[PDB]
Amino acid sequence: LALSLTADQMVSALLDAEPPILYSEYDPTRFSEASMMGLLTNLADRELVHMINWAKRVPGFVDLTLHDQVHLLECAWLEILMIGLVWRSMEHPGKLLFAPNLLLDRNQGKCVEGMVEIFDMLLATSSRFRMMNLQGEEFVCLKSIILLNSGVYTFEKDHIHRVLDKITDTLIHLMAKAGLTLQQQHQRLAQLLLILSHIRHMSNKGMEHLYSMKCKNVVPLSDLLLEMLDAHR
Amino acid sequence: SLALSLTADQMVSALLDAEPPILYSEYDPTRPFSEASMMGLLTNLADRELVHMINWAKRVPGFVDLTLHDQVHLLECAWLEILMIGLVWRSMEHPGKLLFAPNLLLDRNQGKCVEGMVEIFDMLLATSSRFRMMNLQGEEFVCLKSIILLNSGVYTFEEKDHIHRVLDKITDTLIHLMAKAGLTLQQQHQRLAQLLLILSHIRHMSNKGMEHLYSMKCKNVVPLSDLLLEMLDAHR
Amino acid sequence: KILHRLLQE
Amino acid sequence: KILHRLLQE
Ligand SMILES: CCCOC(=O)c1ccc(O)cc1
Ligand SMILES: CCCOC(=O)c1ccc(O)cc1
């Protein structure tokens, strides 16, 4: 029934599907390199469990075979965690809101080797969202696009592309509703989708970094996390 | 102005005019391929294409308005994406193959000759398949290629505002092309989205190709030119 | 795979 | 940097 949804219904479905914002186990009276990476990976693992439930609620997703669902999630999981992070951080210039009780400044990225470069990319994306005044309704559309798009060529396809078109229709509906002219709608749609290229880039860099932490056998990664990482070789 | 003063038709004409030539590889059919010799052909080719790319970039409206440091940054960020989209475009009329050069048309089985390369070939072939599925047009291709140049490094930066104004102009241009082609208003935004979403896949392939090239360099498989070495080093 | 298991259960 | 020089030619 995904292809039968109206724009307003798609928006409502995606807003309702949203995962909860999780807290860190961080104790504000305690950082070290091992400490910080442990907090981030612990949080990432818990977010992943909720991401799986969310994906099942994205219209069209459970129409796919289990194998195709697995493939899409394996491809997109870090992109999805990152766009979520960027969104939460949008109102905190210069900071990344990993959790309400774990709001990190750019410089704390240095507590972990190679992390600040990734932090800077995430912060620049947050700034762009701020620059564009990205709306919550737009954000949820973009996040579903990442889920359906990222692994779609690594393949079913026809249905996925029709669902993607419906999400495009929904983004455009939101812009028209907001009073943008046709020219402004097309420009903004393009601006939003071009951010997805940057998010792909950040995920690939983050995956390299993560694989590096996994080899320097120090920070423990959950079994789920290790499998998600392994899917990228 | 002057880039921002262009009409859609003038934008298309400038980009089409700026297009680099299709170059030949140094392929020698007298000897069998080895990992080293196949990689050597691709890196030698990339190096010669890079010189033409640099001169193409200078002809993309808006690019030469940037400082040299910013021009360097954008090309450093986008070069492999740009080579790859060009390869995928050349390859459209050759299902199952990659037309690296007119004298170098390779299938995935030949890609296996280089360790780790077949995975990249498979992604490029899937992208070429997607272009065919979408019936990508030459005018659309040149717009996408310029978007890559201007977009890929833009969030690693006034200068920025200038770039976004140019990017908006290219969006207007894509839409104009599609409308002139008879697409409905809804088909226009749908196709604009389909085209731009491919750029996510192109970024991914570039990142994987960059990792692979770094691996070849770190294993001394082939000697990279100073230019290639510096373009690669920009990616850490 | 664990992911396989979460997508069903 | 070589690219820097090549951009000026
Ligand atoms: C597995 C990577 C952990 O560090 C992150 O980059 C991270 C963690 C949690 C998030 O929501 C986003 C990123
Ligand atoms: C840089 C090593 C890999 O080369 C390529 O992937 C390649 C080379 C030339 C092209 O036009 C496209 C891709």
Side-chain angles (χ1 to χ4, degrees), chain A residues 2-29 31-112 114-155 159-176 178-213 215 217 219-232, chain B residues 3-4 6-30 32-157 161-179 181-232 234-235, chain C residues 2-4 6-8, chain D residues 2-9:
Chain A
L3 300 179
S4 77
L5 292 179
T6 74
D8 280 328
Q9 290 173 333
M10 177 68 57
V11 172
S12 303
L14 296 176
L15 288 175
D16 293 345
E18 277 293 276
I21 291 182
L22 301 183
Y23 287 87
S24 181
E25 64 273 5
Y26 178 59
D27 184 339
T29 61
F31 283 110
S32 64
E33 172 158 17
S35 166
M36 202 179 86
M37 270 295 292
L39 293 170
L40 298 188
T41 58
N42 182 280
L43 177 65
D45 169 84
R46 295 182 276 126
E47 285 193 278
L48 260 181
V49 177
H50 291 277
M51 182 189 308
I52 292 154
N53 288 347
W54 159 83
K56 282 189 259 178
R57 303 184 59 176
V58 174
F61 189 78
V62 296
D63 293 339
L64 301 170
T65 68
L66 188 46
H67 160 106
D68 280 355
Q69 295 178 33
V70 167
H71 174 76
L72 291 178
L73 279 167
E74 286 178 342
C75 182
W77 69 274
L78 184 53
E79 287 189 82
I80 296 162
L81 289 180
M82 289 179 165
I83 197 182
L85 174 64
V86 175
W87 171 248
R88 298 194 292 274
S89 311
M90 190 179 154
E91 301 314 311
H92 302 273
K95 305 186 188 82
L96 294 171
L97 196 152
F98 283 95
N101 65 348
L102 191 57
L103 179 62
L104 304 180
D105 288 277
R106 182 231 181 234
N107 276 318
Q108 289 172 295
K110 297 174 184 174
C111 315
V112 176
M115 177 122 291
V116 85
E117 288 76 21
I118 297 179
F119 270 42
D120 283 337
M121 292 185 299
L122 292 157
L123 284 167
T125 309
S126 191
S127 301
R128 179 63 177 163
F129 278 14
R130 200 158 49 241
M131 186 178 183
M132 299 186 60
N133 196 32
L134 179 72
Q135 300 295 116
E137 294 84 357
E138 298 175 318
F139 159 73
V140 300
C141 287
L142 290 175
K143 186 168 63 158
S144 291
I145 289 169
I146 292 169
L147 175 66
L148 300 177
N149 180 62
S150 283
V152 71
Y153 300 145
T154 324
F155 280 156
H159 173 74
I160 292 186
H161 287 293
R162 296 180 76 89
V163 178
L164 284 167
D165 287 341
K166 207 65 165 159
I167 304 172
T168 301
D169 291 347
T170 304
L171 277 170
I172 288 290
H173 160 82
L174 292 160
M175 299 174 186
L180 279 57
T181 72
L182 186 59
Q183 181 178 26
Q184 290 172 333
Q185 302 172 19
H186 295 154
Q187 284 175 1
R188 182 174 182 85
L189 171 61
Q191 292 158 9
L192 291 178
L193 300 178
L194 289 180
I195 306 175
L196 303 189
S197 159
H198 296 282
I199 292 169
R200 183 79 81 135
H201 188 69
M202 289 188 303
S203 170
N204 289 140
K205 292 318 204 61
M207 204 72 70
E208 244 186 345
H209 179 75
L210 186 51
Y211 180 76
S212 172
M213 304 289 86
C215 281
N217 230 320
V219 51
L221 281 38
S222 70
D223 287 323
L224 177 54
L225 226 45
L226 286 173
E227 299 192 352
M228 304 306 287
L229 176 58
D230 194 78
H232 285 255
Chain B
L4 299 182
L6 290 181
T7 68
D9 282 319
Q10 293 171 328
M11 176 66 67
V12 170
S13 293
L15 299 180
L16 287 172
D17 289 343
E19 273 293 276
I22 296 186
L23 301 183
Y24 275 80
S25 76
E26 301 192 331
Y27 174 58
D28 183 20
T30 76
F33 280 119
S34 65
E35 174 174 72
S37 75
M38 187 175 287
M39 271 308 305
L41 294 182
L42 306 185
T43 56
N44 177 267
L45 184 64
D47 173 81
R48 272 178 296 121
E49 297 183 275
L50 279 172
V51 189
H52 284 271
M53 182 191 302
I54 290 163
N55 290 278
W56 160 84
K58 289 171 67 173
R59 298 185 61 176
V60 173
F63 190 79
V64 297
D65 296 333
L66 307 163
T67 70
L68 287 181
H69 289 324
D70 290 351
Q71 298 178 27
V72 164
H73 178 67
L74 294 174
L75 277 162
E76 281 178 336
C77 182
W79 67 275
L80 184 56
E81 290 187 76
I82 294 164
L83 291 180
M84 284 179 169
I85 199 181
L87 170 65
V88 170
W89 175 249
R90 296 198 286 283
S91 300
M92 269 195 64
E93 304 299 297
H94 301 270
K97 300 193 176 59
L98 297 171
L99 192 289
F100 284 93
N103 68 338
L104 193 60
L105 185 54
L106 297 176
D107 53 54
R108 87 180 293 272
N109 285 334
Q110 290 166 306
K112 295 174 183 177
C113 174
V114 178
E115 190 184 29
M117 175 63 68
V118 76
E119 284 79 12
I120 298 157
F121 274 33
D122 288 338
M123 295 186 288
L124 292 158
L125 290 167
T127 304
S128 198
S129 170
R130 178 63 176 155
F131 280 21
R132 269 195 312 277
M133 182 187 316
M134 290 191 67
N135 191 28
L136 185 70
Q137 302 294 119
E139 298 85 352
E140 290 170 328
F141 164 71
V142 298
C143 289
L144 287 179
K145 193 167 53 153
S146 285
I147 288 165
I148 291 170
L149 173 67
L150 300 177
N151 181 61
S152 286
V154 78
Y155 303 137
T156 12
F157 277 3
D161 201 89
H162 167 66
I163 288 180
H164 284 111
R165 275 175 287 153
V166 178
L167 284 168
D168 285 344
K169 270 281 178 185
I170 300 172
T171 298
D172 296 344
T173 302
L174 281 171
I175 293 292
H176 171 79
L177 289 169
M178 290 174 195
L183 274 61
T184 68
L185 191 50
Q186 288 163 346
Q187 290 176 332
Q188 287 167 39
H189 71 242
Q190 289 172 348
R191 186 172 177 86
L192 176 61
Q194 291 157 10
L195 287 181
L196 297 180
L197 285 178
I198 298 177
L199 301 196
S200 166
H201 300 277
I202 291 173
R203 180 80 81 140
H204 185 72
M205 294 189 299
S206 169
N207 292 329
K208 306 302 283 198
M210 203 74 66
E211 293 180 36
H212 181 261
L213 177 54
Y214 184 79
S215 181
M216 302 287 88
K217 180 192 86 97
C218 294
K219 301 188 304 181
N220 284 232
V221 175
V222 287
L224 300 185
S225 69
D226 296 336
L227 175 59
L228 205 41
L229 281 171
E230 291 184 348
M231 305 298 289
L232 177 64
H235 285 259
Chain C
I2 295 173
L3 174 57
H4 200 94
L6 302 172
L7 280 163
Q8 306 201 242
Chain D
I2 301 170
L3 175 52
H4 178 82
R5 172 76 180 263
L6 288 183
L7 279 157
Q8 299 173 251
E9 310 204 317

